[PDB]
């Protein structure tokens with residue numbers, strides 16, 4: 001698939017929706033980003049950074065009216081340059097739940113509450129993207 005890739009989420013997200021992204025991190029990658037969007041707002045930005053001051057960190061945040069909010073940072077970093085990955089995002093009633101390579105990684109409490117209006121997922125960064133799909137569990 002071509003990156004950046006836009007995956008429509010028809011009628012928005014709902015609890016029990018599972019999104020699966022398969023790809024390979026490029027050698028010498030700098031960043032990956034998943035952006036769940038509500039129009040111009042970003043309800044959930046998930047942003048692995050491979051070199052922030054010589055550390056690897058995952059930054060999560062929300063953008064409202066063009067302004068970024070308070071960051072939530074995770075130091076557990078399961079991505080590896082050059083290697084294949086699987087990201088699964090499970091929508092639960094109170095948070096997005098993220099697993100990488102079948103291991104739980106983090107939860108992100110819903111700040112944007114109109115879940116039915118979060119109707120696009122943007123996938124970008126230094127990856128080769130193999131597939132991006134959703135199903136209901």
Ligand SMILES: CO[C@H]1O[C@H](CO)[C@H](O)[C@H](OCc2cc3ccccc3oc2=O)[C@H]1OC(C)=O
Nearest residue numbers: 031033045047059060061062068069070071124
């Ligand atoms: C406060 O802004 C930083 O932190 C934000 C999260 O709190 C975003 O990750 C944002 O990134 C959004 C962003 C970065 C980007 C980088 C390359 C290409 C396209 C990009 O599109 C973006 O929205 C960051 O901004 C910078 C300089 O990386």
Ligand SMILES: [Cl-]
Nearest residue numbers: 111112113114
């Ligand atoms: Cl809202």
